């Protein structure tokens, strides 16, 4: 019931435009309104889940208007095994024909008023926090 309420409001409410789904909505869900897809955490090298997740935005309602191009973001940390797994989980999309564009920088990022975890003090606090993450009558007696 709660997830259905979330979906209905994210669909028809003008106030809400973005949601944070998880592995539950990876496949076999029809979202005619969904248009943009972002991945911050991925299930290792799963190539099938890569395509299933991409499938959610392939049926966007406004997928025929001139000049429309859906977006699929994959955030990965450089100089880590996350790059290994990221390059391993897109070998099926590359085979199909889809090509990923590497974005080194997003222009105009500094002009945003507030950014999460912008201060080194908060960085240190988050560092410590994340590191610390790991006889029916006798019935009356009782």
């Amino acid at each position: 019931q709660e997830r259905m309420n979330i979906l209905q409001n994210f669909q028809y409410n003008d106030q809400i435009n973005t949601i944070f789904l998880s592995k539950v909505g990876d496949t076999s869900i029809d979202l005619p309104e969904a248009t943009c897809l972002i991945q911050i955490s991925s299930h290792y090298g799963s190539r099938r889940q890569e395509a299933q997740r991409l499938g959610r935005i392939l049926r966007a309602k406004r997928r025929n208007d001139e000049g429309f191009n859906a977006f699929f973001y994959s955030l990965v940390s450089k100089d880590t095994q996350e790059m290994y797994y990221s390059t391993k989980r897109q070998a099926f999309l590359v085979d199909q024909g889809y090509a990923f564009k590497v974005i080194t920088h997003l222009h105009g990022m500094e002009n945003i008023p507030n950014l999460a975890y912008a201060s080194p003090r908060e960085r240190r606090e988050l560092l410590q926090e994340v590191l610390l993450k790991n006889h029916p009558l006798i019935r009356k007696m009782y």
């Binding site: 001139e66 000049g67 590359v94 085979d95 024909g97 889809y98 090509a99 990923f100 564009k101 590497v102």
Partner: protein, 445 residues
């Protein structure tokens, strides 16, 4: 770049040597064609009149629009000392070199030429069957040895020595092998005309004590000759020079009479495609080319997996790209090769892509990208990966008694451009090994 390179080499020559170089009409006919059209027009105007014309009269001919071209023409003509400026009676009179004038007059009017262009034996041979095959095979052998593919008949010690002593084809005996360089890849990217001119220019610079004027006599006369006909045999130096030129696949000898080949005429002037290829988003290359030279050059930055008669199929991989980059090849050069050997299908699809881009937003004229941007991004990213670690050789300066002295030394290093890093709080800085001696001397003084 052809005329520019030849003109630069001819400009670097001394005037004393140029005056003797202009003796033979054969050399003059070749040098004349290389100059800009305006310079050629002025030279033709001056050749037929035995008088002196002021520079202002020449300036009058050029329109206001071509005034810029007039400056380049006059500068180029004066650089080679072709026009001798004589100032007298308050006027900067301009005159042509007498030797150049007489040579042009003889060539054009069929005057005495001293057989500079050679003679004819009237004993013709089959050009297509023998000349074409011989030159094609020999040029293929040299280019194959350059690209590094195995080949049985290795090139002669003459051309091998020229290659090593030139920047082309860096070799080391300790490694015991020869590898291509950045200039080597650029040479392979250049056209046949420039490919021949590069080697000939390197030979010209290599030769020492065989006269410099004689070498140009022979080369320009060879350019004058026409393929498919005999030419009886000349200078004593030119005999051994002809034998050496036979090693480059330009002139064919029976084993008394020498015959120019297609490359001889190619030297003078210029003159689906083979080499056109398709690049897919899967980092796959399909080149509709049937030539071992093209296959070998593609192997530099392509991990070949198979081949067919009509085409060659391969895959781009980090290993192959790193091999090509380690050889000194630039991603710009690689993309230039791919762009100039793009398939008509790729070109048409890219034209449609540009048309769609402009139709969507015609205000901005986006560049024409024949191949997908992802491949370019990946290649440049791999180059950045190779460039990730940066190291310098030098020494660190610290333990400075006075901040004034520290600032003085650091500022001197910055002024002479040998400063790489500094820190005022620590009063420390690092300088390049090249500038270490200069910094030490300044510190002592």
């Amino acid at each position: 770049s052809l005329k520019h390179s030849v003109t630069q080499y001819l400009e670097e020559i001394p005037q004393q040597v140029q005056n003797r170089l202009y003796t033979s009409p054969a050399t003059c006919l070749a040098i004349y064609r290389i100059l800009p059209p305006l310079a050629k027009f002025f030279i033709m105007a001056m050749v037929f009149n035995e008088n002196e014309v002021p520079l202002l009269d020449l300036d009058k001919w050029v329109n206001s629009n071509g005034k810029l071209q007039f400056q380049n023409a006059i500068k180029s003509m004066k650089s080679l000392h072709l026009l001798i400026p004589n100032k007298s009676s308050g006027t900067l009179m301009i005159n042509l070199n007498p030797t150049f004038k007489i040579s042009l007059r003889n060539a054009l009017t069929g005057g005495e030429v001293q057989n500079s262009f050679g003679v004819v034996v009237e004993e013709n041979v089959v050009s297509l069957d023998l000349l074409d095959e011989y030159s094609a095979n020999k040029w293929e052998t040299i280019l194959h040895f350059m690209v590094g593919t195995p080949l049985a008949k290795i090139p002669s010690e003459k051309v091998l020595n020229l290659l090593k002593h030139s920047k082309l084809m860096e070799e080391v005996n300790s490694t015991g092998e020869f590898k291509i360089t950045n200039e080597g890849f650029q040479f392979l990217l250049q056209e046949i005309n420039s490919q021949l001119w590069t080697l000939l220019l390197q030979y010209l610079k290599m030769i020492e004590t065989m006269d410099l004027v004689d070498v140009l006599h022979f080369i320009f006369m060879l350019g004058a000759l026409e393929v498919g006909k005999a030419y009886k045999i000349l200078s004593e130096t030119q005999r051994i020079m002809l034998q050496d030129m036979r090693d480059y696949g330009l002139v064919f000898q029976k084993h008394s009479i020498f015959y120019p080949t297609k490359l001889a005429l190619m030297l003078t002037s210029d003159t689906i495609p083979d080499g056109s290829l398709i690049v897919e988003t899967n980092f796959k290359i399909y080149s509709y080319s049937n030539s071992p030279l093209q296959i070998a050059v593609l192997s530099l930055f392509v991990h070949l997996k198979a081949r067919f008669v009509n085409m060659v199929l391969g895959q781009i991989t980090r290993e192959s790209i790193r091999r090509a980059l380690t050889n000194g090849i630039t991603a710009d050069q690689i993309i230039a090769y791919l762009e100039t050997h793009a398939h008509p299908q790729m070109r048409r699809l890219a034209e449609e892509k540009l048309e769609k881009k402009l139709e969507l937003d015609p205000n901005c004229k986006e560049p024409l990208q024949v191949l997908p941007p992802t491949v370019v991004d990946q290649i440049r990213l791999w180059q950045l990966e190779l460039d990730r670690v940066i190291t310098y050789e030098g020494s660190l300066y610290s333990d400075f008694e006075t901040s004034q002295e520290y600032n003085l030394l650091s500022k001197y290093a910055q002024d002479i451009g040998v400063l790489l890093w500094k820190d005022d709080k620590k009063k420390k800085f690092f300088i390049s090994k090249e500038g270490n001696s200069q910094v030490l001397d300044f510190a002592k003084r």
